[PDB]
Amino acid sequence: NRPNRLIVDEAINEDNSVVSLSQPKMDELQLFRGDTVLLKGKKRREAVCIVLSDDTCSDEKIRMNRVVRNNLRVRLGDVISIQPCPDVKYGKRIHVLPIDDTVEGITGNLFEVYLKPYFLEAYRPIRKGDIFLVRGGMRAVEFKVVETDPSPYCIVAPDTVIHCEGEPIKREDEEESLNEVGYDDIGGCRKQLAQIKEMVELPLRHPALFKEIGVKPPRGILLYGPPGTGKTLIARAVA
Amino acid sequence: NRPNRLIVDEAINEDNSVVSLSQPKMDELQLFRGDTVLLKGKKRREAVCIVLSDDTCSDEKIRMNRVVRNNLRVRLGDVISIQPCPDVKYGKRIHVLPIDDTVEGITGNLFEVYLKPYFLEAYRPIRKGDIFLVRGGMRAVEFKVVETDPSPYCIVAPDTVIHCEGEPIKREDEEESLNEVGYDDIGGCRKQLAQIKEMVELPLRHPALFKEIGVKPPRGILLYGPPGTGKTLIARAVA
Ligand SMILES: Nc1ncnc2c1ncn2[C@@H]1O[C@H](COP(=O)(O)OP(=O)(O)O)[C@@H](O)[C@H]1O
Numbered sequence A, B: 001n002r003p004n005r006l007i008v009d010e011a012i013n014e015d016n017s018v019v020s021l022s023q024p025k026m027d028e029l030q031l032f033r034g035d036t037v038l039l040k041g042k043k044r045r046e047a048v049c050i051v052l053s054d055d056t057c058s059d060e061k062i063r064m065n066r067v068v069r070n071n072l073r074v075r076l077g078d079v080i081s082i083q084p085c086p087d088v089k090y091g092k093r094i095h096v097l098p099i100d101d102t103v104e105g106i107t108g109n110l111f112e113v114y115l116k117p118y119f120l121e122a123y124r125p126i127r128k129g130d131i132f133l134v135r136g137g138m139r140a141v142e143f144k145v146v147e148t149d150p151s152p153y154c155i156v157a158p159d160t161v162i163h164c165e166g167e168p169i170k171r172e173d174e175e176e177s178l179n180e181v182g183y184d185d186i187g188g189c190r191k192q193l194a195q196i197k198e199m200v201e202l203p204l205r206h207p208a209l210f211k212e213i214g215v216k217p218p219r220g221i222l223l224y225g226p227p228g229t230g231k232t233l234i235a236r237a238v239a
């Protein structure tokens, strides 16, 4: 049962963090316009996002973004649990610790120039254990904290200060590189990606379905197009 | 800051040693028509050149010649320091010492026939540590002194005499052969060399720019043209 699950669907808006809901959905969770949504992944982790209310763009579909796909290990064709958090929390102390994995070629203070004139009039909520990208320096670096104030109680506020230690921590292989090519990196092909989406996720996302049924699974797929259309890119993304 | 640097630009005049300036440039350095310009390279070396004043040929660009490119280890896309030297010095004693590296096939006295009827009405200034070429004998030989009067105080005057010792000095590998093919050895191709000039000096003259930006650098360049147009010559020069 549990009439509150939302199936993951493809996103069409190239925005940062906006989730579209339906008119009946506000009355079920008594959620306001701008609230803090709490999501449960696996391995005891949580994620925070920003919900948007609209009755013109979407009808009964969610718009789940890649910024939280790797933060919950949730892919296409998976269920998730939604729960409002109307509690008011204002962060005042945060911890920052860069990892010695992608700091090559970067010198000086980068926080005071990339994080200060970007978070104003945004009020973006953050949580311990989130991987977010920034647009600066003709590239995109990541961030990950390992020890900070107990979650949540993390709100970007001007009262926070900066600090440095000089002792980086060693990264682990538990998580994957979010910088790799995804489903948001292919554009201009709606009808062509749809066929791949409706033939690849059956024998891969649900392998157990095919040992029990006698239906012939597709074994070989041929790609066409002039050189450079992105045949390799699509194959890299769908895998 | 330092509003006195001059960016190295391509030269169009096939002259020997002439530098073109602008009208405001004379009033900043209070330099006369014919003066002795002092240039600072690296590894504690100096160079001397002759400046020309003109307000019709160039507007705000320098014409830096290859005769002083190898004497200061300065290439395209580099900064230099300019400084006038209004001091009057007249040389009366110079030292000459040929190196046993390119004297093969040359017999007899070559100075009295190549240097005497060439420096009259020229007043070309010279300095200890300069590599200059001469036009004589269907070739071009070089010269380099290792011990002479303290720099500068070197002016070509008729009062100087000649001398010989017979003990050549061994050359070193610190400097390169100026006789190799350069940017002044290709003519008749203005638009074609411009594209190479605006695609090769980014990832070579400034390698550190590309480890920090995500811009795709050009990896392969294809050359065209009938046999003998100089495809090898251009590649040899740009490297
Ligand atoms: N539709 C597309 N969307 C985004 N990038 C594309 C697209 N088509 C081609 N590219 C770019 O082309 C690059 C290489 O082309 P690719 O598709 O990998 O080779 P091929 O076209 O032979 O499969 C990719 O890195 C990608 O950035």
Ligand SMILES: Nc1ncnc2c1ncn2[C@@H]1O[C@H](COP(=O)(O)OP(=O)(O)O)[C@@H](O)[C@H]1O
Residues within 6 Å of the ligand: B185, B186, B187, B188, B189, B226, B227, B228, B229, B230, B231, B232, B233
């Ligand atoms: N534009 C040019 N300027 C000066 N020399 C040239 C030019 N084009 C051809 N040459 C002469 O042709 C010689 C050999 O031609 P090269 O270009 O090296 O062979 P290819 O044309 O097969 O690359 C060069 O050493 C050079 O003297």
